[PDB]
């Protein structure tokens, strides 16, 4: 009176054809490949329906994963057959290798279908060159500083006028590419001044690469906005303009 017996994702029969069996029949079943090794037995039970051992078939277990260093593995589910991993890596380090990993049969038993890969510090080109001056360094990687510093004479007194952050450093705008934060300083004579910014405001007079002391720069608010403060302006020691204008 019993019909077919149900059709197991995790098992198979030992001897596989029929539809009618009657009540106290046995069938030798067996768990499939990636399940923990065991043969077992379905009855038909006196109100025509199959019953099978709890928790028969148990998935085989892959090599305990690891989080990279400076990187984390994810399980998502579990460390069993079929199951898939995941990994990233901290910020200031990039990927190398596969991302992913999934338990699968190898052999006789299972394992991850890939190696757990790499997260190496982003690295950075060696930082800008500038003229009459240089970096002081301990090979770039992120999160690394420069200070850069002006030369001085031969005899090791004040040359130039360092103008700008003195120090930048490595980071990562994309986790892959390795930038340096800004722009490097310059090392600049002290009877020059260099070309002066005010937002939203042009130079009406001539434009240089380099002003010298003294030399005056006439500025014009865009359409919009207007002066507050003096249109002009002159170069003065140290990189000053005296008086310091604006554009609201």
């Known amino acids: 009176q019993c019909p077919a017996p149900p059709l197991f994702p995790y098992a198979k029969p030992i001897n596989p054809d029929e ?7 046995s069938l030798k079943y067996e768990c499939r490949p990636g399940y923990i090794k065991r043969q077992f037995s379905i009855t038909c039970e006196v109100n025509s329906v199959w019953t099978s051992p709890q928790d028969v078939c148990i998935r085989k277990q ?7 260093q400076n990187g984390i593995v994810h399980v998502n589910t579990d460390i069993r057959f079929g199951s898939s991993i995941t990994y990233t890596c901290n910020e200031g380090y990039r990927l190398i290798g596969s991302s992913s990993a999934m338990c699968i049969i190898s052999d006789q038993s299972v394992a991850w ?15 800008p060159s500038i003229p009459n001056g240089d970096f002081f ?19 090791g007194k004040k040359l130039f006028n360092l103008v700008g952050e003195p120090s930048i450093h490595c980071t990562s705008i994309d986790g892959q590419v390795g930038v340096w934060s800004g722009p490097p300083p310059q090392c600049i004579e002290l009877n020059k001044c260099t070309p002066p910014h005010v937002e939203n405001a042009v130079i009406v007079s001539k434009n240089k690469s380099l002003f010298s002391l003294r030399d005056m720069v006439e500025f014009r608010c865009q359409d919009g906005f207007m002066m507050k403060g003096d249109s002009s302006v002159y170069c003065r020691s140290l990189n000053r303009w005296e008086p310091q204008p604006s554009c609201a």
């Open 113 to 127: 279908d890939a190696e757990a890969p790499i997260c190496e510090s982003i690295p950075c080109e060696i930082p």
């Open 19 to 25: 539809s009618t069996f009657p009540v106290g029949t």
């Open 62 to 68: 892959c090599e305990t994963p690891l989080d990279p």
């Open 137 to 155: 360094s301990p090979d770039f990687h992120y999160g690394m500083v420069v200070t850069y510093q002006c030369n001085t004479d031969a005899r």
